[PDB]
Design a protein around this ligand. Structure first.
Ligand code: 9BM
Length: 127
């Protein structure tokens, strides 16, 4: 089995918290990206077996995807907004590292990232 286990989406020992910033990240940021027409390749972990990408998990050692992020938010896995923002950045970065500049998947990622940055620019203050 050449896929690694997916990133954890819950952990009984990791402290849980709900902030208005994390609620914004689920209700506005994640929702906006999730339903976007280019979202689908990013909605679940990269299945390197089914996609026939043997070298993927030899190159990408910190995988991340929006399915994982969605579940983390729904499970109150994050303590703060920065943890979640970091996961989005990891997802985009992995795509830019593994794929060639100008590839369709890169253009899809760039479009989602632009939308992401717009919404993060409008992050609300802590209540
Ligand atoms: C190439 O990047 C991906 N492609 C798919 C994918 N389809 C696919 C397969 C080969 C070539 C091109 C594609 C397109 C997405 C451009 C159509 C599928 C699928 O067909 O179900 C699923 N997950 C992916 C993740 C990725 C992906 C992401 C996201 N980041 O790196 C990779 C690699």
């Amino acid at each position: 089995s050449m896929n690694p286990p997916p990133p954890e989406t819950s952990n009984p020992n990791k402290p849980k918290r709900q902030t208005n910033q994390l609620q914004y990240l689920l209700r506005v940021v994640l929702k906006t990206l999730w339903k976007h027409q280019f979202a689908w390749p990013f909605q679940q972990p990269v299945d390197a077996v089914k996609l026939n990408l043997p070298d993927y998990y030899k190159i990408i050692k910190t995988p991340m995807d929006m399915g994982t992020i969605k579940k983390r938010l729904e499970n109150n896995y994050y303590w703060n907004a920065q943890e979640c923002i970091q996961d989005f950045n990891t997802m985009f970065t992995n795509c830019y590292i593994y794929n060639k500049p100008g590839d369709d998947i890169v253009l899809m990622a760039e479009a989602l990232e632009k939308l992401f940055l717009q919404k993060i620019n409008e992050l609300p203050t802590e209540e």
